[PDB]
């Protein structure tokens, strides 16, 4: 059900935590495959979100928080947590109950809301995307 710019998206957040050796993915490292996905980038731009600050403060909290495998064995493949879980399922579903065939990047975007205490929201709100105006954009827009 998903579309292929957001199928490349999520292949492309897998291979960046692979080449990391990072051992779990989060929402955050979703919301950054999201920032060069068409449908949600596009969606930030009509909200004038300053998308260059945005990704820098994402990348450096990634960084900064997210364990690296050492050149030890086991798990070496990456695993998305909960919530990177739970906002895919979310999309997907509520999709489902709109009664349209294709999850965007954008309906990811919005799903990303609903995890009010991640830091992925947190900085949303600190650079002022509106979820408002994001829901809006979506409804109307596509």
Do not use: W
């Not at 050796?21 to 909200?47: D, G, I, K, Q, Y």
């Amino acid at each position: 059900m998903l579309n292929q710019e957001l199928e490349l998206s999520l292949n492309m957040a897998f291979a960046r935590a692979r080449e990391h050796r990072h051992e779990f993915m989060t929402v955050e490292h979703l919301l950054l495959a999201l920032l060069s996905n068409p449908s949600a980038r596009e969606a930030l731009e009509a909200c004038s979100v300053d998308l260059v600050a945005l990704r820098q403060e994402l990348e450096a909290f990634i960084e900064q928080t997210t364990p690296v495998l050492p050149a030890s064995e086991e798990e070496r493949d990456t695993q998305p947590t909960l919530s990177f879980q739970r906002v895919l399922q979310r999309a997907v579903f509520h999709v489902q109950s709109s009664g349209r065939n294709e999850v965007t990047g954008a309906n990811v975007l919005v799903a990303i809301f609903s995890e009010q205490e991640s830091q992925a929201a947190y900085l949303l709100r600190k650079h002022e995307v509106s979820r408002l105006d994001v829901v809006n954009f979506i409804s109307h827009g596509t």
